[PDB]
Amino acid sequence: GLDSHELARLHELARHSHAVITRHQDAGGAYPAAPTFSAYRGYAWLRDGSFTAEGISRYGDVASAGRFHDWVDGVLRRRRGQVDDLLAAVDRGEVPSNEGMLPTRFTFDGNDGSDPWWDFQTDGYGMWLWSVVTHAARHGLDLERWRAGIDVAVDYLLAFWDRPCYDWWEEHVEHRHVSTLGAIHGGLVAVGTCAALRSAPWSAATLQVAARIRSLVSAEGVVDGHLVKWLGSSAVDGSLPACVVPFGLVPPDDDVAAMTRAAVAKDLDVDGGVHRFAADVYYGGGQWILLSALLGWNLAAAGDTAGALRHLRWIADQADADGDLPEQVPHHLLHPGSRAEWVARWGTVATPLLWSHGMYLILADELGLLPP
């Protein structure tokens, strides 16, 4: 395993991961993406926030995780009318524009941070359902605290799960991304198998739609035995292992899960650093801490502890002076010529990225390395 040299370093990084996340949590409950990055600062994402919240929940700060769930819940209850209006529009056969849909960026006071025309995404609503159910399960909490917000997210996802949207990386609005479908699946299966939610009017519908997502991924999201980045594609994306653990399109032991871990490792993993996708020119297409953590998590879940440890150590070696984890590092770049213009425009890469720290805490936890 680890000598006390490593255990010591990994424990201290976990404590710092907790402190970074909780210190930068907004007064209202939102977890920001990155407090100091020009392009992300002042905004919260349900995707970043939900993995961040799961990290914090595993670590055991019930107060912080709860305040984040309270924030999301209240933001969604305020969208009850917008979501009812969208559904009624569908019922009249008037397919609403991407511009009228629920946002991707939120302000800390729960307003659209951006025009959904430019960044329409559905994965975050699915991740939040997964996050809040998993938190309530872990800590014996009453989901009625967050139920009215869960109802908004479920109603929204049951109507719009099969709609093309931008991927986690804000690309290709015309496609249906297997890690977006995966995130929605994980959320629907979480609420649909939750005994506290057995009487919800949407209970059985969540499992029927989760089955329709799995049908669509079987038909168009599997090539040469592995998942693909979007329906009708041959290529992989670094997010795909999330479709095994924790979103559960397939379990860890499934041959598609094995083939997907192997395809991601072969195509996108360089010396423990996982790239997003082959064409990625964002800061030259560097190695993403959260993707190394995600692949590590999935190797742990599949019984490959060694594989998991190698990725955790890789992540730990990217911690800076203060123990802050960046979004990505440039040790290997897919398109090195593109880096300078990004640094020039937006500054040095987001550091800390709270999602980097949340994924650190999850992988540490999967390996039994949180401080005791």
User: Is 161 marked as binding a ligand?
Assistant: no
Name the one residue in this structure whose structure tokens are 């123990």: 323
Among 244, 249, 301, 319, binds ligand [N+] (CB under 6 A): 301
As a whole number of angstroms, the distance between CA 231 and CA 363 comes to: 28
Residues 6 or more apart from 294 whose CB is under 8 A from it? 238, 239, 241, 242, 274, 359
| Residue 366 interacts with ligand [N+] (CB under 6 A): yes or no | yes
Touching ligand [N+], residues 112-171 (CB under 6 A) = none
Q: Of 235 and 258, which CB lies nearer to ligand [N+] in the complex structure?
A: 258
As a whole number of angstroms, the distance between CA 109 and CA 33 comes to: 15
Q: Of 134 and 206, which CB lies nearer to ligand [N+] in the complex structure?
A: 134
As a whole number of angstroms, the distance between CA 235 and CA 232 comes to: 9
Say how many residues touch ligand [N+], by CB under 6 A: 3
Say if CB 249 and CB 284 are below 8 A apart. no
Name the residue whose CB lies closest to ligand [N+]: 301
Minimum CB distance to ligand [N+], residue 301 (Å): 4
Measured CA to CA in angstroms, residue 206 lies from 91, 134, 214, 239, 274 at distances of 19, 16, 12, 23, 32
Minimum CB distance to ligand [N+], residue 362 (Å): 9
SS3 109: coil
As a whole number of angstroms, the distance between CA 258 and CA 226 comes to: 8
Name the one residue in this structure whose structure tokens are 């397939």: 250
Going by the DSSP 8-state scheme, the letter that residue 28 receives in this structure is: T
Touching ligand [N+], residues 342-361 (CB under 6 A) = none
| Residue 256 interacts with ligand [N+] (CB under 6 A): yes or no | no
**Contact characters 261-300, ligand [N+], x per CB under 6 A:** ---------------------------------------x
Q: Of 73 and 366, which CB lies nearer to ligand [N+] in the complex structure?
A: 366
Of the candidates 330, 289, 346, which has an alpha carbon nearest to the alpha carbon of residue 313? 289
Minimum CB distance to ligand [N+], residue 292 (Å): 16
Minimum CB distance to ligand [N+], residue 140 (Å): 20
Active site residues: 167, 170, 327
Minimum CB distance to ligand [N+], residue 133 (Å): 16
Give the binding site for ligand [N+] (CB under 6 A).
300-301, 366
- Residues tagged in the binding site annotation for substrate: 117
- Residues tagged in the binding site annotation: 117
